[PDB]
Amino acid sequence: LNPESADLRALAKHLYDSYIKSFPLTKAKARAILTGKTTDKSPFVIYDMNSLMMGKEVAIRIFQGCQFRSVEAVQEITEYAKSIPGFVNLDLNDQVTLLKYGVHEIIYTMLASLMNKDGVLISEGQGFMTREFLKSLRKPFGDFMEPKFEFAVKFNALELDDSDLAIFIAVIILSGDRPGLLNVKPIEDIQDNLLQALELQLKLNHPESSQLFAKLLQKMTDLRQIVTEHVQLLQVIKKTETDMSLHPLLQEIYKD
Amino acid sequence: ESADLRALAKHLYDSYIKSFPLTKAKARAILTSPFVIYDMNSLMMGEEVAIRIFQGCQFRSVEAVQEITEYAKSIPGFVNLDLNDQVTLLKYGVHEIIYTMLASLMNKDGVLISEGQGFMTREFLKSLRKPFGDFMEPKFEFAVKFNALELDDSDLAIFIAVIILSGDRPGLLNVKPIEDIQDNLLQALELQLKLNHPESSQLFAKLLQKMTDLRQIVTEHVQLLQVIKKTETDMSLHPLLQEIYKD
Ligand SMILES: O=C(O)CCCc1cc2cc(Cl)ccc2n1S(=O)(=O)c1ccc2ncsc2c1
Numbered sequence: 001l002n003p004e005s006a007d008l009r010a011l012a013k014h015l016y017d018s019y020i021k022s023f024p025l026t027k028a029k030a031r032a033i034l035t036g037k038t039t040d041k042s043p044f045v046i047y048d049m050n051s052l053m054m055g056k057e058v059a060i061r062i063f064q065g066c067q068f069r070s071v072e073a074v075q076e077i078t079e080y081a082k083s084i085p086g087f088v089n090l091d092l093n094d095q096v097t098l099l100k101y102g103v104h105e106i107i108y109t110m111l112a113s114l115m116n117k118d119g120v121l122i123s124e125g126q127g128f129m130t131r132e133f134l135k136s137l138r139k140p141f142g143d144f145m146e147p148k149f150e151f152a153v154k155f156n157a158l159e160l161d162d163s164d165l166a167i168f169i170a171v172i173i174l175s176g177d178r179p180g181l182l183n184v185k186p187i188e189d190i191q192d193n194l195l196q197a198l199e200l201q202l203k204l205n206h207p208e209s210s211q212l213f214a215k216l217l218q219k220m221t222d223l224r225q226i227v228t229e230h231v232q233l234l235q236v237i238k239k240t241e242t243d244m245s246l247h248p249l250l251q252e253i254y255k256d
Numbered sequence: 257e258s259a260d261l262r263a264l265a266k267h268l269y270d271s272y273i274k275s276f277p278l279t280k281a282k283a284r285a286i287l288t289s290p291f292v293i294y295d296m297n298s299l300m301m302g303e304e305v306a307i308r309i310f311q312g313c314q315f316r317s318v319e320a321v322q323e324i325t326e327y328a329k330s331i332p333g334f335v336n337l338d339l340n341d342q343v344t345l346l347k348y349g350v351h352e353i354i355y356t357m358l359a360s361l362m363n364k365d366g367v368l369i370s371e372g373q374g375f376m377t378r379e380f381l382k383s384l385r386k387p388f389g390d391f392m393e394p395k396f397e398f399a400v401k402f403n404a405l406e407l408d409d410s411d412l413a414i415f416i417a418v419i420i421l422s423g424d425r426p427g428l429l430n431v432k433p434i435e436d437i438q439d440n441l442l443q444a445l446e447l448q449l450k451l452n453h454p455e456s457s458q459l460f461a462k463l464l465q466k467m468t469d470l471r472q473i474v475t476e477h478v479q480l481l482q483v484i485k486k487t488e489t490d491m492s493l494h495p496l497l498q499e500i501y502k503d
Contacts, residue, residue: 217464
């Protein structure tokens with residue numbers, strides 16, 4: 001290669017490294033747990049009430065647990081964000097805006113890593129809660145996870161690994177078509193670079209996968225819908241469950 | 257190889273020119289002489305006001321759907337798909353294409369209408385009643401961003417075909433051949449933008465990301481269209497007219 005796509009490989013390497021250091025449960029660990037494996041080890045499976053207890057009603061602590069984890073993930077993603085070259089040099093206000101619109105799309109992207117068609121890993125991989133148990137939860141909580149699984153099954157079909165995902169989520173943060181950005185130009189120059197990095201990375205890592213770059217970027221449409229749909233379901237849960245609390249961090253991100 | 261990709265591109269451009277009366281090249285020249293509609297008086301002396309304007313947007317959309325349908329049938333492979341699947345792809349595709357192509361007819365201040373014989377002001381449209389004042393605005397906001405890419409008709413012809421061959425539409429029966437065709441169209445689009453816009457880095461990626469905005473415009477637009485159902489309704493003189501305009 002030439003010394004320009006060489007700078008692109010170094011950026012890919014930097015981002016992957018930051019990704020490993022920022023996120024405790026990688027796709028590689030998640031698949032080892034889900035699949036096999038002598039590396040890593042067996043999850044306790046929650047598929048019903050008694051299994052849940054072996055692990056204030058249940059639909060609601062399950063939702064409460066999920067939202068605490070969300071906040072947990074926002075902290076991890078925010079820590080990854082800082083490592084993206086150029087990010088912390090941007091107008092502070094735009095850093096906040098990029099994160100605000102970025103984190104949930106990233107959350108559901110990385111959530112796919114922890115999912116198969118049958119359920120999702122929980123508690124850093126020590127548990128596995130089935131899709132059917134989640135869906136059997138009560139109106140409305142019953143289908144708050146379903147659009148996540150639907151996306152995940154289609155996304156996981158791309159067979160990305162962590163080194164791919166690391167650049168992808170960086171692309172997502174550095175959008176610049178985000179509402180209310182002050183300096184779009186500096187943001188777009190960064191994303192242009194990241195998109196180059198992602199394109200080279202996918203050609204090298206998935207040579208036989210045609211137009212993976214285009215198909216992965218199209219997935220960005222699925223994410224936005226999940227987020228939009230989740231936000232609305234949340235508005236509903238708030239009004240019907242007036243004793244349901246939301247974390248102010250998530251509320252602050254949700255406001256608008 | 258680049259052989260089939262350039263023929264694909266040329267073919268779609270030719271079909272695009274044939275199927276769509278007003279091209280972007282044509283519209284851009286005019287935007288830079290049309291009857292301007294800035295007021296009620298200009299609307300009248302060039303023609304329920306806000307309702308006549310909405311129903312005119314409907315007439316135009318119905319026309320556009322037929323133009324898009326004809327274009328689709330020109331996309332190599334499209335007519336060989338399961339017919340249910342062709343109908344599904346057009347069904348969920350035309351709104352996104354309608355607004356994509358509408359951006360060709362807009363600047364930040366207004367939109368061409370009636371074959372470019374007219375031009376309706378963004379402020380006049382925005383000044384309309386409720387809810388008829390918020391229906392066009394999000395399209396102007398999309399258009400301002402989309403037009404920043406400065407695509408031309410030969411770029412758009414292929415992009416439009418990419419949108420039509422979306423293998424993720426609900427209820428598709430055989431997704432494989434649809435993705436197979438889109439893959440080829442994506443290749444052709446990538447090479448087109450690389451040849452036509454060498455100095456514009458990652459234009460292919462930027463355009464694809466625009467699809468997420470498209471989808472949201474369409475989604476929130478159909479949600480306003482239901483709200484319009486809770487405005488005007490039962491009139492036994494419409495029926496045949498109402499039938500012509502489904503969704
Ligand atoms: O193992 C990990 O790293 C935690 C993996 C994720 C996770 C941990 C967890 C713990 C409990 Cl007690 C309950 C649900 C849990 N989930 S989750 O998948 O349901 C989830 C997470 C984020 C999120 N944001 C919007 S909806 C949503 C749902």
